């Protein structure tokens, strides 16, 4: 709600960005692409 | 028995593989193992060891001492002579 | 000591106090003009478990010589059969 | 410890000797009919553990006939430990391991009709629940000593009672009987301990008075010039100038006067 | 000259009714230490000591005789390191400090039994603290009773 | 334990800065040991009884005392083909969710704990503010070695409060006294003669007489008027302290004292917290002559 | 009469040897003298088995019980990972303030020996080996100069110590600040040297003596397992004051106390309290 | 008795007459075992009737003025808090407590009963050295009663709560004069020495 | 006999709670009444209706 | 002895014959050790350990970190424990008013002799005990 | 084993007594001023926001997810009597006790008091003792 | 084990340095669920007064610690997929934990699918090792001071601003980001960002932070109360270290007092 | 079938159910209430006989 009570303490904080992070992993969108999207330079040069 | 003594020398899995068992599954004939020795014998029960105890208090104070009556202990300075006494007892 | 050896001891000793020991203890207490442990002794006699039991009693023989040594001893507040009175004691009490 | 239909209800805790193995029992008669507590036969098995000192599980196991409900049709075994939920004393038993052929007691679904018999009790507070006024007093088994209807004042009357507690002006009252008490920390503090002799425990507390040998000549160098300082051996002494004597259990640290 | 004591905020005098004499006289077992020993400021030797105290005033008051057995069972962990030093060292007494041992443990050294401790748990509360959990093995058993020739 | 032992403090503290009354060490022990043994008594009963939760679907079952201790685990045969690391996590969330049910009976019955414990502390607190003399200045008035200042701001925006009656003194005695009076006037009169013959009025004699309890029956026996303790009007640690020895005297105002001064510390944390989170006070100091120029 | 533990409570089949009291089998000499020898080694054997129970280390029993809490029914094959992650790390140290360089374990081809040392650190001087010029004169152990090296710079309160780098010595300094005598240390895979760190505390050091075993290396002192034991003993009070530090015939550097332990007998080093 | 153990004992309604001429209404609720009344509302285990006898034999006695005997004594006697002299409160005290701890004190010693006390000496005990292990303590009331048996606590509602911590944050404002103590109220010292 | 009457007077005069500057009259870094600044701001406002 | 030494031991110059040898140096030299002693605690303070001896001291922390489990850590939800101030609040009276404050709660003239309860403390004093206020006086 | 026998140590010296303790020097025994709370410490009260640190959340003091409201531990005070003990005692409390002056305790317990010009003014009122001396 | 968590102690104070310069302070699994043991041993030992966590970098990196390691997760979750691949490809093949009606290809197939949901109990793993450590962090016992010395990713920033004191050098840096990496962000800091108090003072600077992966500094983790200590002084850890050393006893009024005028000379922010 | 739900939708292998509630007869402060006066307080108080 944005109300101070609504606000979710840090144990639900962490379960609740979890059950996020879980759900979205599975996606090849992070794992194939963006995991190497930051990269540096030189380990894209030896990669290639 | 100790470090001096005689040694004792020395892909799939092995028959020492099946015995055991996953202490979540319930184990063969339930033996009724008492809770606090399955705790101590795995080494998570709490310790208390003698290093815990602190001073035995004396809580009964036993009696009044009182003075015992030695040899070196007489009103006159005789008594306490060298031909008779050698110390106190 | 001996009572307490009569149960305590492995070897020679009997599970529960026989009727024997009993008296014997009392006849001791009795024989030695001991006046307050006979009477604590009776009365923690009949509140053991061998008494409500029935292993252990208390006879005519035992009562009687209890009660006569209750008799013949000093009594703490009270004058006792077997006072003997002191004639010249009119010195002070003021009655002969 | 509770009660209901006129007997008690115990929970214990059933142990072998090295306390390995254990069993609770919910409620339990206490039935003073029974001169050893009974157990079923199958426990045997269960609450046996072979330590060192007990390479079989047990030092006693035996034959014995005792039918009591309802040869050998028995065993004997032990020592087994017993926690009661009231005791802080443990009892160990020697009880009779019966099969199911010479008693079986199922006796309500789940229910085992498990009892305690005086072989337990002598050993318990539960004891003193068996003296007249108590309430094991009824189910005592009858004798000549026990009588069964008498009213508590009636009997204790007949032995020594006469009054209510400490009623008479003559016996003191039971509390006057420890007034103060002595915890060294809440008052006057710790004593200064001294010793002569080879340690703490094998000499005396009590240094020499002043009647020795030694100590006179410095004594009396100490009484004629007080104010200077004076040689001997007459310091070891109990005696000495300053007021504070040493003696035994001076309190050296109490805030004193 | 006796007139000044150490500690005014504990008096003697007012330890004579003992606390809460209603409630552990009526089931002793309920009543560990613990629950009493929150009452007083002090530190653990002090009101255990006094607790003993308490037990024995309130039993001498209710013309019934006290357990002995209290002292031993309140400083049992004192109990054994004393049977146990007198083992050791040769000698009959109460074992004081000059004869501890000198070993210095690191600072951490009681993470397990912290862990072990932190992470316990407990089907009743009689369980949590009984009087005998300081009891694992039978040499434990037969050092806390060696005393009465009964047990 | 710790949101008790700060109200205590606050409490003792208060005492000596309004009144020179010590509270004695034994008491103050005393009032915290009663808040303890009244949860110890919660965990006796709440041992008793029994939570369960569950995890997948009602696929794993864990029971649990609402203590968190583990009784009993069902599983369906379907969880034993996972693994024992999904195995593992599966029963763990279950535990979890039996914890989550377990704590929250816990916290209601906390909640009952801590009102009674209030309850126990309103004689006290009561006491010390309910006296024709007690009286406050507001925070923010400046104060001098003659006596305080007064806030200049908003003439508007300061209003003194009263608690007591400025008349002759009625106390909270006479409103039980009241209450027992109109107690028996109802009872006494027709409409409270049939209805003590309900099962209202036979319920509210069950709870409420206590002169109906048989000898021997658990709870008090009579009904008991409310606890007077006024401060100012009663001696209570100091008197005896300051007849046996000064020494303890002025250690024990020592105390008081400081527990006072560091509950005032904390009620000015909060009230920095309060005042930085809506945004009126920054995050460090900007003004220095509030604190400097003294 | 509810009964918590036994779920069959009775079991009718069993019933016991002696009560049953089938009609005894009568064997031959043979057969009773067999069985009384098979069942008198058999409880040899479990008052055995009891014994190691007891006597078995703590590490050993919390391996025992997380072995057997992770087992699973199939002997599971390992899952390849990412091209390494298992190189042991290199020891973080600062590049600019520095007493050395942390070398990379990676070089490791690099690196010379005690005697003859690769060239590295070459803006820090170099400690000499020690030898001696004259026959009659000490054959000196880079223990005796460690040992030295740390008295010195204990008396003059320095914060750290330059000192040679070999095997027994980095032993010794790793048992030392075990015991908590020394601040810290490092090695950075120099090859001559390695750096210790003092403590101090209340104005003076932590170390009131440290002293070689030996004074040559043409003496070698032998310590007994009774000899150790006799060190912690004064007078019937266990005491760990001083601390001892041994060679074991495994190669390993170890204080008095653990050698006492599992009763090995080791090579004296050095004594420091 | 508020509470879930206090009902009351085994009670007589008649024939089948005349409890159809008693009971107007009657409703029914399912069944469910029988509690065994608890030990302070049953009638023949809690029964006294010597205390009430001698209550009254000595009724007279409290009709009268009370008078210290040591006369010019004015000032109360004061009674400590605790001492078991002074205990008013029995919780769970029957008839059956109070004549178990008779009994136990009786057997404890016999001479503090005795209206002209005999000399009392320990002799010694038939239980063993022990002993002290079978006896001690006093009567222990059964758990059941303990644990169960207490009135229902009257709820608290959040108003009193409100109230009180009002009342609580009342107190912890500053009061004038502590923080620099007038110079007038540090004369004020006096000690006993 | 003086510094015991210092000690007891020092200590039955001293000061606590919090002042206007937030801080007991105790605290290490900040002060109150700084060259009787206190005093003189009695002295010349003085307390009258 | 002087020290209290029960377990001591202590040997001047390794033969007794071997010089300096004085009564002088027999007494400096035992002062001298004696004063060089390290005491164990200092000893295991210096290395930053803790002592064998010392640890029964961390049993009841160790103790109630055992016996916390379930309803002894738990906090009441809502409540810190810091109440913050408000309100002003003052009770204070005119005397006239506190004259007769309590008269039927406790005695008539309650306050009478009480000079910080008012600031009239002569009000409601029988003559007598006015008397008696002055006749100490003089 | 260990042979040596606690019982058995110890020479006897004839009539020279000496002191033992039963457990800790008597200096280290009463610890008032860390009961009482007299040190400097409390008085700079610097340190004393920390404890209630918890207070830097508003939403969370209320909410008690974190069971560490305090200092050491659990709570600000679990123990306060016990547990600061395990340092080793450096720098003990010693005699406080101000009943009397130094020069009264001084004067009855030692014998020096009767000669105060063989004492230097540092020791002045200082001894609570008797002390033997000894012309070598 | 690993030379991945290395410490240095004083007599009342301890230090925990994070040593992993190759991958951005990014922690492992198993360096994780290790330091949660090594935090908590040394905030439950007995002298510490206060414990301090920071980066040890040896000049290699700049981050105060990492997030997850991406690498590694990224790895094993590709690997998790392609098992996947190769079982529903013989899936497919036989139907042209699944059972079926051929012994060989279940077998494999099994094979195949078990292995691949180890690999994903790998990264389930390490998400719960993280949110463990963080929860180890708030809930320490003993004051955990983190010195937060440059930057931190999402589950770092974690880390380093649920201490309860949480201190910030000029360095320190929070990047909460991930959805440029395409997943959500983890690390808790969601909470912070999302207290009424952030929604006053910054309306909208939640979703800039979430939406946009966009660092924040030391002034603005100021502001907004997330951390009450700062300090300019080089290597404060050593003067830590020393000042815990003068100190004396450890009641915990000494403890307070030493502690706290610590934090009022360096860490909180005057003249 | 312990989650399994049946045909028509009731549960196999009945669920296990909680029985624990908040006791209501619990308050300390009138178990150990004043020695004479009934008082549920924790109070210490000493009278006059
Ligand atoms: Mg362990
Ligand atoms: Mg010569």
Redesign the interface.
């Known amino acids: 709600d944005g109300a101070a009570e609504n606000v979710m303490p840090l144990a639900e904080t962490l379960g609740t960005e979890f059950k996020y992070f879980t759900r979205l992993m599975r996606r090849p969108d992070f794992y194939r692409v963006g995991v190497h999207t930051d990269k540096s330079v030189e380990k894209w040069e030896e990669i290639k | 028995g100790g470090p001096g003594s005689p040694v004792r020398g020395p892909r799939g899995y092995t028959a020492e593989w099946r015995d055991l068992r996953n202490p979540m599954r319930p184990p063969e004939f339930p033996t009724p193992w008492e809770r606090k020795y399955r705790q101590y014998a795995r080494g998570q029960h709490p310790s208390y060891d003698m290093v815990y105890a602190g001073p035995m208090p004396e809580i009964f104070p036993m009696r009044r001492d009182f003075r015992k009556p030695t040899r070196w202990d007489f009103h006159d300075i005789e008594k306490q002579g060298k031909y008779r006494t050698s110390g106190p007892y | 000591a001996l009572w307490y050896r009569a149960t305590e001891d492995p070897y020679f000793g009997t599970p529960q106090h026989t009727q024997r020991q009993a008296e014997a203890l009392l006849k001791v207490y009795v024989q030695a003009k001991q006046r307050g442990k006979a009477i604590d002794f009776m009365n923690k006699l009949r509140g053991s478990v061998e008494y409500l039991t029935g292993d252990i009693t208390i006879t005519t023989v035992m009562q009687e010589s209890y009660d006569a040594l209750l008799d013949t001893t000093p009594h703490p507040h009270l004058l006792t059969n077997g006072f003997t009175l002191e004639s010249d004691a009119a010195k002070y009490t003021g009655e002969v | 410890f509770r009660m209901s239909g006129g007997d008690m209800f115990v929970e214990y805790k059933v142990l072998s000797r090295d306390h390995r193995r254990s069993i609770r029992v919910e409620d339990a008669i206490v039935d003073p009919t029974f001169k050893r507590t009974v157990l079923p036969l199958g426990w045997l098995e269960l609450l046996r553990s072979p330590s060192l000192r007990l390479p079989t599980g047990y030092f006693v196991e035996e034959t014995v006939h005792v039918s009591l409900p309802n040869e050998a049709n028995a065993i004997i075994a032990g020592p087994v430990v017993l926690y009661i939920t009231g005791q802080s004393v443990p009892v160990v038993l020697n009880p009779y391991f019966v099969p199911e052929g010479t008693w079986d007691m199922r006796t309500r679904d789940g229910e085992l009709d498990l009892r305690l018999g005086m072989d337990a009790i002598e050993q318990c507070t539960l004891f003193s629940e068996l003296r007249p006024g108590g309430l094991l007093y009824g189910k005592l088994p009858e004798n000549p000593n026990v009588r069964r209807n008498e009213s508590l004042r009636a009997t204790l009357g007949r032995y020594g009672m006469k009054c209510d507690l400490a009623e008479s002006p003559l016996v003191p009252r039971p509390w006057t009987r420890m007034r103060y008490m002595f915890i060294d920390e809440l008052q006057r503090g710790p004593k200064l301990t001294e010793f002569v002799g080879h340690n703490p425990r094998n000499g005396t507390p009590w240094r020499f008075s002043q009647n020795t040998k030694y100590f006179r000549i410095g004594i009396w160098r100490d009484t004629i010039r007080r104010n200077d300082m004076n040689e001997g051996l007459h310091a070891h002494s109990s005696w000495q100038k300053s007021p504070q004597q040493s003696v035994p259990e001076v309190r050296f640290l109490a805030p004193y006067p | 000259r006796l007139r000044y004591e150490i500690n005014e905020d504990y008096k003697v005098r007012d330890e004579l009714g003992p606390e809460l004499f209603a409630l552990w006289s009526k089931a002793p077992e309920r009543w560990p230490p613990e629950r009493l020993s929150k009452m007083y400021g002090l530190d653990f030797t002090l009101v255990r000591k006094i607790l003993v105290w308490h037990h024995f005033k309130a039993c001498y008051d209710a013309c019934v005789e006290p357990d002995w057995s209290l002292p031993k069972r309140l400083f049992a962990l004192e109990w054994i390191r004393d049977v146990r030093a007198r083992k050791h060292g040769l000698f009959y007494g109460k074992m004081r400090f000059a004869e501890q041992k000198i070993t210095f443990y690191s600072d951490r050294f009681l993470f397990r039994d912290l862990v072990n401790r932190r992470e316990a748990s407990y089907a009743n509360v009689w369980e949590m603290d009984d009087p005998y959990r300081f009891l694992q093995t039978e040499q434990d058993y037969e050092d806390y009773w060696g005393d009465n020739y009964d047990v | 334990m710790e949101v008790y032992r700060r109200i205590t403090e606050r409490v003792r503290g208060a005492l000596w800065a309004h009144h020179g009354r010590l509270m004695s060490e034994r008491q103050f022990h005393r009032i915290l040991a009663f808040v303890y043994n009244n949860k110890y008594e919660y965990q006796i009963r709440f041992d008793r009884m029994e939570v369960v939760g569950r995890e997948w679907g009602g696929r794993v079952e864990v029971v649990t005392t609402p203590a968190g201790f583990l009784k009993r685990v069902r599983v369906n045969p379907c969880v034993e083909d996972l693994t024992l690391y999904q195995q593992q996590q599966l029963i763990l969330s279950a535990y979890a969710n039996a914890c989550a049910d377990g704590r929250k009976l816990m916290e209601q019955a906390e909640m009952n704990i801590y009102k009674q414990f209030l309850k126990d502390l309103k004689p006290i607190v009561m006491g010390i503010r309910d006296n024709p003399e007690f009286y406050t200045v507001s925070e923010n008035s400046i104060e001098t070695i003659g006596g305080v200042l007064q806030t200049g701001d908003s003439n508007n925006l300061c209003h003194t409060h009263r608690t007591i009656p400025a008349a002759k003194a009625r106390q909270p005695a006479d409103e039980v006294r009241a209450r027992q009076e109109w107690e028996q006037k109802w009872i006494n009169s027709p409409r409270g003669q049939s209805w003590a013959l309900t099962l209202r009025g036979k319920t509210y004699f069950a709870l409420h007489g206590p002169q109906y309890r048989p000898r021997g029956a658990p709870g008090a026996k009579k009904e008991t008027l409310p606890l007077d303790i006024p401060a100012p009007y009663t001696a209570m640690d100091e008197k005896r302290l300051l007849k046996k020895n000064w020494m303890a005297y002025l250690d024990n105002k020592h105390v008081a004292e400081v527990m006072w001064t560091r509950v005032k510390i904390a009620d000015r944390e909060k009230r920095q917290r309060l005042l930085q989170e809506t945004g009126r006070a920054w995050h460090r100091p900007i003004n220095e002559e509030a604190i400097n120029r003294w | 009469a509810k009964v918590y533990g036994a779920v069959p409570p009775l079991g009718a089949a069993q019933g016991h040897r002696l009560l049953h009291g089938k009609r005894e089998r009568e064997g031959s000499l043979f057969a009773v003298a067999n069985d009384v020898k098979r069942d008198e080694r058999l409880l040899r054997q479990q008052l055995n088995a009891l014994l190691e129970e007891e006597r078995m280390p703590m590490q050993a029993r919390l391996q025992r019980n997380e072995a057997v809490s992770s087992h699973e029914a199939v002997p599971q094959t390992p899952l390849v990972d990412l091209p390494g992650v298992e190189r042991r790390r290199d020891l973080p140290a600062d590049p600019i303030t520095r007493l050395f360089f942390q070398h990379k374990g990676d070089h490791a081809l690099y690196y010379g020996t005690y005697d003859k040392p690769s060239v590295q650190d070459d803006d820090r001087v170099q400690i000499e080996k020690r030898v001696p010029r004259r026959r009659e004169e000490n054959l000196y152990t880079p223990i005796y100069d460690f040992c030295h090296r740390i008295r010195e710079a204990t008396e003059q309160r320095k914060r750290f110590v330059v000192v040679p780098s070999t095997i027994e010595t980095r032993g010794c300094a790793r048992v030392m600040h075990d015991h908590g005598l020394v601040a810290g240390f490092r090695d950075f895979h120099n090859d001559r040297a390695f750096a210790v760190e003092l403590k101090y505390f209340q104005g003076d050091s932590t170390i009131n003596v440290i002293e070689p075993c030996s004074y040559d290396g043409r003496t070698e002192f032998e310590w007994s397992p009774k000899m150790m034991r006799r060190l912690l003993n004064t007078h019937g009070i266990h005491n760990r004051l001083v601390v001892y530090i041994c060679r074991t015939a495994d190669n390993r550097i170890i204080d008095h106390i653990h050698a006492v332990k599992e009763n090995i007998g080791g090579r004296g080093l050095m004594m420091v309290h | 008795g508020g509470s879930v153990l206090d009902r009351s004992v085994a009670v007589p309604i008649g024939d089948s007459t005349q409890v159809r001429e008693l009971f107007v209404e009657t409703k029914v609720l399912g069944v469910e075992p029988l509690q065994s009344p608890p030990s302070w509302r049953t009638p023949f285990r809690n029964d006294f009737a010597e205390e009430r006898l001698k209550e009254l034999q000595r009724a007279p006695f409290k009709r009268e003025k009370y008078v210290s005997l040591i006369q010019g004594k004015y000032t109360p006697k004061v009674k400590k808090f605790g001492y078991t002299q002074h205990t008013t409160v029995d919780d769970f005290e029957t008839k059956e407590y109070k004549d178990r701890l008779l009994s136990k004190q009786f057997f404890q010693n016999p001479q503090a009963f005795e209206v002209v006390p005999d000399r009392h000496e320990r002799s010694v005990q038939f239980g063993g050295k022990w002993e002290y292990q079978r006896t001690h303590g006093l009567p222990t009331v059964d758990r059941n009663e303990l644990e169960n048996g207490w009135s229902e606590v009257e709820p608290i509602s959040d108003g009193e709560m409100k109230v009180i911590e009002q009342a609580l944050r009342d107190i912890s404002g500053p009061r004038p004069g502590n923080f620099v103590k007038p110079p007038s109220k540090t004369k004020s010292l006096q000690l006993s020495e | 006999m003086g510094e015991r009457m210092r000690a007891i007077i020092e200590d039955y005069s001293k000061g606590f709670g919090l002042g206007p500057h937030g801080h007991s009259p105790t605290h290490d870094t900040i002060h109150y009444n700084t060259l009787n600044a206190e005093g003189e701001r009695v002295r010349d406002l003085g307390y009258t209706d | 002895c002087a020290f209290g030494f029960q377990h001591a031991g202590c040997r001047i110059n390794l033969k007794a014959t071997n010089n300096p040898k004085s009564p002088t140096h027999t007494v400096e030299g035992v002062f001298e050790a004696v004063k060089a002693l390290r005491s164990v605690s200092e000893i295991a303070a210096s290395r930053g350990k803790v002592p064998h001896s010392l640890i029964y001291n961390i049993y009841p922390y160790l103790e109630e970190i055992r016996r916390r489990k379930g309803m002894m850590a738990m906090h009441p939800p809502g409540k810190d424990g810091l109440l913050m101030p408000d309100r002003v609040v003052d009770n204070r009276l005119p005397d006239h008013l506190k004259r007769g404050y309590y008269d039927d709660v406790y005695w008539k003239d309650f306050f009478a002799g009480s000079d910080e309860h008012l600031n009239e403390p002569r009000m409601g004093l029988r003559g007598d005990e006015m008397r008696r206020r002055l006749e100490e006086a003089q | 084993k260990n042979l040596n026998s606690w019982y058995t140590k110890g020479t006897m010296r004839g009539g020279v007594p000496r002191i033992y303790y039963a457990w800790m020097r008597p200096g280290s025994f009463t610890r008032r001023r860390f009961e009482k709370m007299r040190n400097p410490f409390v008085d700079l009260e610097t340190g004393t926001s920390l404890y209630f640190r918890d207070t830097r959340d508003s939403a969370e003091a209320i909410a008690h997810a974190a069971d560490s409201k305090g200092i050491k531990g659990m709570d600000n005070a679990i123990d306060l009597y016990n547990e600061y003990r395990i340092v080793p005692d450096l720098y003990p409390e010693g005699f406080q006790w101000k009943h009397k002056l130094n020069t009264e305790y001084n004067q009855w317990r030692s014998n020096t008091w009767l000669t105060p010009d063989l004492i230097p003014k540092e020791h002045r009122g200082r001894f609570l003792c008797n002390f033997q001396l000894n012309i070598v | 084990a ?3 968590i ?1 410490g ?4 009342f104070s301890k230090t925990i ?1 994070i ?4 991958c951005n302070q990014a922690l ?1 699994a198993k360096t994780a669920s290790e330091l949660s043991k090594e935090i908590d ?2 905030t ?5 007064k206060l414990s301090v966590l920071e980066a ?4 290699l990196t700049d981050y105060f610690c990492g997030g997850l390691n ?10 998790a ?1 392609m098992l996947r691949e190769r079982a529903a490809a013989i899936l497919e093949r036989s139907g042209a ?1 699944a059972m079926l009606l051929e012994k060989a290809d279940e077998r494999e197939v099994n094979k195949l699918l ?2 691949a ?3 994903e ?5 390490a ?2 090792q993280h ?1 463990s450590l ?2 180890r962090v ?6 955990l001071m983190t010195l937060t010395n440059g930057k931190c990713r999402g589950t770092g920033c974690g880390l380093s601003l ?1 201490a ?2 949480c201190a910030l050098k000029d360095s320190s840096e929070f990047i909460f980001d991930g959805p ?9 800091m ?2 912070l960002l ?4 952030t ?3 910054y309306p909208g600077l939640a979703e800039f932070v979430v939406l946009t992966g966009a660092s924040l500094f030391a002034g603005d983790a ?2 907004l ?1 997330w951390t ?1 200590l700062f300090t300019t002084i080089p290597d404060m850890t050593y003067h830590i270290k020393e000042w815990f050393d003068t100190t ?14 610590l ?2 000379t360096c860490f ?3 003249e | 079938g312990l989650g399994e739900v049946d045909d028509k939708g009731e549960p196999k292998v009945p669920p296990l159910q909680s029985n624990a509630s908040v006791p209501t007869n619990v308050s300390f402060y009138e178990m150990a209430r004043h020695p004479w006066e009934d008082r549920a307080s924790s109070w210490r108080r000493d009278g006059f006989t």
């Open positions: 690993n030379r991945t290395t240095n102690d004083g007599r340095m040593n992993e310069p190759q492992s041993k040394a439950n030992a007995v002298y510490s040890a970098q040896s000049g991406f690498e590694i997760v990224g790895f094993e979750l590709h690997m997929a934990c078990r292995d949901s180890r690999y109990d790998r990264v389930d793993d998400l719960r949110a963080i929860w708030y809930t320490a016992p003993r004051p649920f309860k004191y440029n990496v395409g997943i959500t962000p983890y690390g808790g969601t909470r999302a207290r009424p108090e929604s006053l003072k100021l502001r109360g009450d004396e006893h450890m009641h915990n009024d000494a403890v307070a007092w030493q502690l706290g005028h934090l009022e909180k922010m005057k």
